[model samples]
Target: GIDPFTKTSLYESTLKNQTDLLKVTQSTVEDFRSTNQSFTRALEKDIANLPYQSLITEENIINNVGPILKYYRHSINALNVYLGLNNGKVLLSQKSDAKMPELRDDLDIKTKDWYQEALKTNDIFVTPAYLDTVLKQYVITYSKAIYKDGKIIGVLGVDIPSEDLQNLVAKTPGNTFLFDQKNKIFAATNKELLNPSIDHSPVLNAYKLNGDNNFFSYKLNNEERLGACTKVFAYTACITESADIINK
Candidate 1:
C-alpha cells in the first residue's frame, strides 16, 4: 500500500523547504543582532562622554546612564514587539516603570555587574526564563554591560517574554534548541522539554569538540536529529533538523 518512490520525493521536497526556512530564520535573528550591536555601540560612545564619567558614583551612573539604559530597553522592546506582531514568533516584555527597574529582586542588587561582565568578555549571556516575580509572566533577558575606567557605568539589556522567543523557535518547522555555553538549553520550541536531558544530544559533544564545523547526530525515541553549530557575536546558535531520512 506504500509507494517508496513517491514517499522519497515528498521527503526530498520537505527537506528543501526546511533548509530554506532555516536560512530565513537565521537571517532574521542575525539582522536583529546586528541592529542591536549598532545601537549598543552608539550608546556606549555617548555614555563614555557623559559629564559623570569621572565621578563613577552610583548616583552618577543612575543620573547619566540610567536614561540611556532605559532607552536601550525601550528600543529593543519595540523591535521585539514589532517583529512579534509581524512574524508572530519573536516575543517581548511589557514596559517597565519609568523610574527603571532592579535587575534582581532577591538580593536587592542593582550594581552594574552585567555591564562589567560585558566589558570583560565577548559572549552574550541569556538569563534564565521564568514567570517574572514582578511582572507576573514568563520573561527572558539578553544583556551586555558597558564599562568605563575599569568600572561598569552602564548596562544594556533586551528583555522578551519567554513565550515570544519560544514561539520564534516553534516557527522553525523542525526541532530547535537554543543552548548556552554549558550545553544546557535555556529556551526551546518544545515547552515540555525546556531542560531536557542533553546527555545524548550533539550539543554537549559539540561543546566538547570546540569547533564550529563539528557535526553530530543523535536519536531520541523514534526521532533523529543532525546539527551544526557556530558562534555568532555573543551567543552560539546551533541549528538542527530531525527526521527519518537524510533528504527529509
Candidate 2:
C-alpha cells in the first residue's frame, strides 16, 4: 500500500477542492435565481389582470415592459432572459441584434416544456438542460408560474446557461462528469460523451466500496484514475485526474 498519510492527504485535498467548487456553483446558480426574483415579484401579481387579456386582441399584455429589458443584464457570458405567457406572448432579453423565430401567432408556448413544468409547481425551478436554438448552446431555464386567483395564468422565466456548468466543470483541473442522485449526467468535460450516466461506469463498485464516500479509484476506458465525488448543489459532481499521469 502507498504511504497511508500521503494517500489520506491527497484524497482529503481532492474532496476539499470539489467541495469548494460546489460552493462556487451553488452561488452561481443562486445568482441566476435572484436575477429573476424581481421578475417574479413584479409579475407574480400581474397575472390577475392577464386573465382578461385575450389571445385574439393581445391587449395590455404586460403592465410594464421595463423589467423584461432589465433582465437582459449579462456579464462575461452573453445570455438570454425571457418572460412567456400562456397566450404564446413572449418577451426576450438578449443581444440588441439577435432574434429568434417568434412563437406568437403560430406556436403554442403554453405547451412548451418550461411552461408546463412551471405550471406544475409554484416555486422557481431550474429545468432540465436543453439546447437553445438562439444561443446555439445548451441551456437550463430558471422559471416560475405566474398565478392568479390560485390558477396559473402565465409563466415567467429566464435562461441560465447550462453550458455554464459544462464550462466551469471543464475547467475543474480534472476529467469530471456532473450527475444527479439518480445517476443522470448533467454536464461533462468531454463533449463527445455529453452527459452519460455512471450506472455502467467502471467505478460504480469502486465508489460503493470507497467506505469513506469521499474518494474513488478505478479504471476508466482502461486508464487507472483517482476520483472524488461531490454534492454540487442539486447535482452530484465527480472529478478525476489520471493516476497514470501521476505515476508517469
Candidate 3:
C-alpha cells in the first residue's frame, strides 16, 4: 500500500519541477527565437543594401552568406553546449557541385532547388533535409532567409544536431512536442518518435486534444507532456513590437 501523504507530496513536487522546467524551456526557446530573428534582420538589412541586381552571383552569395553561416554555426553550437545540449553544422550551396568538404552534399539532391523555392517564399523556411545532410540522421532544421525585392538573395539556416529541441520538450518532464501548422511533430521530447513521417499513437492523441490552440498539456505514452504550437501572429508581434521598442 502506498503512503497517501508521501505520494501526494511527491506528486506535488514533480508538478512544481515540471512547471519550472517548462518555464526555463519556454524562456530559452523564446530567447533563441529572438536572437535568430534579430540576427537575420541585421543580416538582411546589410544584404539588402548591396547592389543585388548586379551582385546576385554564386560567388557573392558564398562570400556574404557563407561567413555568416559559419559564425552562426559556432554561436548556435556554443549556446547548445551551454544549455547542456548538442549542436549541428551549417551549410551553404548555390549549385549541386558547389559543395564543401566540411559540408555534406547529400542535401544537394534531396533539397534540390531549395534556393529557388526560398526565393518564392520571401520569408524564412526551415527544412529537415539540411539536418539529414549534416547529422547523417533525421533531424529537423530551422531556417530563415534574407530577402530583397521579393527575391531570396541569401539563405540562412541552423541545423540542430541532436534532440535538443526535444530535450526542451523533455525539460517539461512530460510528453512534449514542437508542432507546425499542420500539427506535425517537427521535434519532440520523446526520442522514440522524433521526426516521424506519420503521427504515432501518442502524437495522434495529442493532435486531437490540441484541436486549435497554441498550447495543450496532456498525458501520453504513459507520461505527461505539453504541446506548444508556434503562431505566426505571435512571432510577428513579438518581432515587430520588440523592434519598435528597440528602435525607439
TM-score of each: 0.53, 0.64, 0.48
Order of candidates by lDDT, top first?
Answer: 2, 1, 3
Q: Which has the higher lDDT value, candidate number 2 or candidate number 3?
A: 2
C-alpha lDDT of candidate 2 relative to the true structure: 0.57
lDDT of 3 by residue, 1-248 (tens): 15777655655554454445445545655665566556555545655667765335545544655554455446555221000001122234222232331333334432433333444575654443233433355443444456567664444444454355445545544444455445455544555545576545453464355543333445544555544333332221000001111112
Candidate 3 Cα misplacement greater than 4 A, ranges? 1-34, 51-54, 78-117, 128-131, 134-137, 149-154, 173-248
Q: Tens-digit lDDT track for model 1 on 1-248?
A: 14788766756665556545545555545665566556656756666667654425544444555565566667666322110111112112236445453223242224333323444575544555544444567765445555555555434545467666546655655455555445566545556556464453555565457565344555557577666555544445555666555534
Worst 10 residues of 2 by lDDT: 54-63
Write one digit per residue (lDDT tens) for candidate 2, span 39-129: 5555455434544543223334433432333434343233665567655777555544544313344335666778778777767766667
Model 2: clashing residue pairs? none
When summed lDDT is taken over every stretch of 10 residues in candidate 1, the lowest stretch is 81-90
How many collisions between residues are there in candidate 1? 3
- Deviation in Å, model 2, residue 202 alpha carbon: 1.8
Count clashes in each candidate, considering only residues at least 3 apart in sequence or on different chains.
Answer: 3, 0, 4
